[PDB]
């Protein structure tokens, strides 16, 4: 954890707090703010481990409280006393975070009012939820009880929040000049939430775009495992069928250097090319480069795919608990590991078409241990009646396919791809 005796640089606070000592520790800062929880403030490394909990927060002077959720509240939304503002803050954080994290991390660009305003809606102390086993994130003065984000309805204080001041990381210039170096999507409309949004965006850029640590693991919070297994199932299905239908002599597999053949029994000449996940801008196809056979780009984000490609590309616009808002239109996809992904661009696919759903199988029609569909490509459907085994497998594959799509992945293929060509493999 971050030692409370660590020095805190106070130059960013001195316009809101004139006269503040240059020599300052976290210990003295927390005291001046009026306050298993050794420090309210955390290290960059702890913050990165808890990116799902990040909420940018800015206060502008009555005071306008702005959050990276887009919300502005005025404490005296129009101005209201702190005793009702705090209730809204609890509800807002609880609904934003209950399916993401066991805590909140306020990401600051600290100039003073934000820190001195915390005592009006934060309480600290040593706890678990009164109604479950999750750690407590809220407190209620009405009942003198504690709750997690799931059981906090009607609570009035944030309990043991964490926080980090981006201005401690060693920047020159103000927030907007640093944020705008990397991102054109978030403006500065001069409301507190705009600053809150830029602050979080800059932190995401510093910690996941220019710096990358794929060794950090993140807890399971949703359908991660089913999604990942579906992606492997779809990858095998689509590539196997492409090879059967068009009989490419060579396949160029471009992407993760730890990739394995997804169709190990295919006859094709399989050649690998190493490219790590690009976290900043999509790769330029000119630099990466292939006109023989087919190219496979499985989550290898390029600016324009060649016409002879099979592509899986994550759609950064998808709304889900796994996909967090990112930098310059990118998104931070957190599924076991954290992957910042450049903004989705439909123009990357101009040479391709959307891959249609289909299910293909050459396995024997046998049930161990009634489906009608034009897209069940099997011997039994060719012959007029889908067998029970392929019926079961088709419905499982459909489920997997829909899971992958709903998670944000999109699939694209060379324009000549035609499932009609699979029927003659039977
Ligand atoms: C009541 C009331 C108040 N409204 C504001 C407006 N906020 C800003 O102009 C701003 C500047 C930078 N970021 N936001 C401050 S106090
Ligand atoms: Zn609970
Ligand atoms: Zn931004
Ligand atoms: Zn069958």
The number of angstroms, rounded, from the C-alpha of 355 to the middle of its chain's C-alpha atoms is: 25
Q: Which residue has the tokens 């934000």?
A: 114
Distance in angstroms (rounded) separating the CA atoms of residues 157 and 165: 22
Strand partners, 315: none
**What is the sign, positive or negative, of the torsion defined by CA atoms of 215, 220, 221, 223?**
positive
Burial of 383 (0-12, 13-18, 19+ CB in 10 A): exposed
Residues in contact with ligand 1 by the CB-under-6-Å rule are: 60-64, 74, 79, 190-192, 195
Please check whether residue 409 is in contact with residue 312, taking contact to mean a CB–CB distance below 8 angstroms: yes
Residue 55: both structure tokens together: 């909420």
**52 SS3 class:** helix
Phi first, then psi: give them for residue 48, nearest 5 degrees: -65, -40
Whether 415 contacts 354, CB under 8 Å: no
Strands 138-140 and 157-159, sheet pairing: antiparallel
**C-alpha of residue 160 to centroid of ligand 2, in Å:** 15
DSSP 365-398: ---------TTEESHHHHTTS--HHHHHHHHHHH
Dist CA 318 CA 219 (whole Å): 20
**Angle, CA 361 vertex, CA 359 and CA 365 arms, to 5°:** 120
Q: Is 201 annotated as a binding residue?
A: yes
Is 23 assigned a catalytic role? no
Instruction: State the burial class of residue 18 (Cβ atoms within 10 Å of its Cβ: 0-12, 13-18, 19+).
Output: exposed
Last residue before each gap in the chain (C to N over 2.5 A): 35, 61, 76, 126, 289, 369
Which tokens hold the place of 156? 């009035």
Provide the token pair at 319: 């709304």
Tokens of 40: 């309210």
- Segments of 53-115 assigned E as strands: 54-60, 63-67, 72-75, 105-108
Experimental approach was X-ray
190 annotated active-site: yes
What letter would DSSP give residue 146? E
Active site residue 1: no
| 199 secondary structure, DSSP code | H
- Entry resolution (Å): 2.0
Domain ranges in the chain are: 11-209, 224-425
**What is d(CA 74, CA 52) in angstroms, rounded to the nearest whole number?**
26
For residue 350, the tally of other CB atoms under 10 A from its CB is 9
DSSP 346: G
Alpha-carbon distance 245 to 267, whole Å? Answer: 13
DSSP 80: B
SS3 call for 252: strand
């Amino acid at each position: 954890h971050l030692s409370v005796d660590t020095k805190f640089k106070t130059e960013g606070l001195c316009v809101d707090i004139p006269g503040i000592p240059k020599d300052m520790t976290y210990r003295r800062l927390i005291s001046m703010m009026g306050f298993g929880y050794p420090n309210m403030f955390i290290t960059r490394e702890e913050a990165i481990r808890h990116v799902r909990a990040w909420i940018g927060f800015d206060v502008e002077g009555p005071l306008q409280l702005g959050f990276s959720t887009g919300v502005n509240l005025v404490a005296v939304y129009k101005g209201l006393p702190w005793n009702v503002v705090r209730i809204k803050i609890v509800q807002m954080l609880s609904d934003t975070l209950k399916n993401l994290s066991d805590r909140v991390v306020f990401v600051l660009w600290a100039h003073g009012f934000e820190l001195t305003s915390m005592k009006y809606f934060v309480k600290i102390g040593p706890r678990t939820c009164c109604l479950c086993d999750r750690r407590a994130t809220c407190f209620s003065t009405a009942s003198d009880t504690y709750a997690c984000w799931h059981h906090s309805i009607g609570f009035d204080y944030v309990y043991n929040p964490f926080m980090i001041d981006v201005q401690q990381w060693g920047f020159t210039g103000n927030l907007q000049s640093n944020h705008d170096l990397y991102c054109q999507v978030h403006g500065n409309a001069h409301v507190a939430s705009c600053d809150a949004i830029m602050t979080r965006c800059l932190a995401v850029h510093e910690c996941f775009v220019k710096r990358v640590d794929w060794t950090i693991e993140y807890p399971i919070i949703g359908d991660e495992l089913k999604i990942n297994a579906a992606c492997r199932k779809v990858q095998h299905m689509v590539v196997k069928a492409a090879l059967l239908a068009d009989k490419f002599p060579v396949l160029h597999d471009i992407g993760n250097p730890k990739a394995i053949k997804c169709v190990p029994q295919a006859d094709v000449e399989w050649k690998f090319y190493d490219a790590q996940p690009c976290s900043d801008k999509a790769y330029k196809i000119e630099e990466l480069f292939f006109t023989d056979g087919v190219c496979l780009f499985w989550n290898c984000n390029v600016d324009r795919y060649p016409a002879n490609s099979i592509v899986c590309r994550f759609d950064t616009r998808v709304l889900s608990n796994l996909n967090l808002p990112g930098c310059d239109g990118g998104s931070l996809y957190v599924n076991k590991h954290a992957f910042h992904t450049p903004a989705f661009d439909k123009s990357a696919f101009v040479n391709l078409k959307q891959l249609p759903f289909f299910y293909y199988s050459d396995s024997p029609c046998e049930s161990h241990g009634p489906l009608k569909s034009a897209t069940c490509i099997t011997r039994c459907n060719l012959g007029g009646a889908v067998c029970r085994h392929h019926a079961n497998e088709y419905r499982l594959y459909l489920d997997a396919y829909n899971m992958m799509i709903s998670a944000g992945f999109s699939l694209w293929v060379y324009k000549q791809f035609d499932t009609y060509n699979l029927w003659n493999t039977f």
